[PDB]
Amino acid sequence: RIVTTSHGTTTSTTQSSVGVTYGYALTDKFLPGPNTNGLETRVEQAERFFKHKLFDWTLDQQFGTTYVLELPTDHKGIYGQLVDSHAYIRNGWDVQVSATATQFNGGCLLVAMVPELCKLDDREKYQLTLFPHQFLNPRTNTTAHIQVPYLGVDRHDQGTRHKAWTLVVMVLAPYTNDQTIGSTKAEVYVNIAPTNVYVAGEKPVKQ
């Protein structure tokens, strides 16, 4: 189960792949519309991986515990520069999430990409599976991988503010370390890459 995903000059090799989950579409085909007057352009240089630590999966967290990361997030690289130079932007996301625990640990995290996530009740958590997702189950894998397209009532967004997608990682079954050799916690990391980024409406950066 060795799979290497690569974007630009960045690669990622996992040895416990469980496949990729494509959400709502097999591809993010870009169909230009009248909102950009044909002036939009793709910036491939932006389509590369960036990393973030999300949280530490620990023994006390119980079912329902939820960590989210709204996208687009703050970026200290090329992607972030686009935001200062252009008024409008659109892109999809290639998401890899990991929780490195030993095979002698137990529990299970649910990883999902939810659109327009303003609020979530506790009952709604039992149905998070209606959203593109995968599972982190120590006995089986340490990697999740979901790929989703750009989504929205508008063909483009006016720089952030609107977070069409929110990554959500929630504890289904609590982490365990009852077999002596496991670890007491598992750090949860995110490896994301924006895909098909098209921007429009240039303005001056700086002053």
């Binding site: 959400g23 709502y24 579409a25 085909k29 169909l31 519309g33 009248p34 079912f63 095979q103 002698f104 640990n105 137990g106 529990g107 299970c108 009952r123 958590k125 039992y126 149905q127 599976t129 209606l130 599972f135 189950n137 120590p138 006995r139 089986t140 397209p149 989504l151 289904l172 079954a173 609590p174 365990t176 009852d178 077999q179 496991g182």
Partner: protein
Amino acid sequence: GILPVAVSDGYGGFQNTDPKTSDPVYGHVYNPARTLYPGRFTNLLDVAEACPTLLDFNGVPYVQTQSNSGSKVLACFDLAFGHKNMKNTYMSGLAQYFAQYSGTLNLHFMYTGPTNNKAKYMVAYIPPGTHPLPETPEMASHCYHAEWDTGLNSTFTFTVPYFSAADYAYTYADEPEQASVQGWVGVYQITDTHEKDGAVIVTVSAGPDFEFRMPISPSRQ
């Protein structure tokens, strides 16, 4: 002369679910293109077949080895959308809007234990009128059942069948109904290496031949 016409009593009143259209009033509006928009769905049952949702066992989606009790029963519940275990599922969510259903159901079990913790489980469909609901694997083995053990594959899927005198069953339970008219499903643990729990996440989805009829707005209190 002109066309003689007979206006009929009982016909014509406003209707909320009628098969006709209203008269138009604002023409020539062309919509923005919504070509290739993702995630489209057409029938609730397509999403209901493909996306299993979590059962609730007193606050948690998993069943478990547990503490004190030489009880091998992990869960035994009425085959009913109104049972409290089914409370937060998409299937029960939808079912509140239909009067009847028919068809099969799929129950899924995902094992969460560490690599060295092994167990062996079993699930059975207990038909109505069965007397002392079996509490042991041994007794329950006399019903339609499936036994499976842990290993490389974490998940196991079971098919809850449809038996009844009638072709359709009701999604709701009448007040005077002492026993489950549709029977029960019992989930048992035959054995486990380690008494420190190994959580089994339980989930439910529509079977390939499941069906709902009679939409109803059961509204209010």
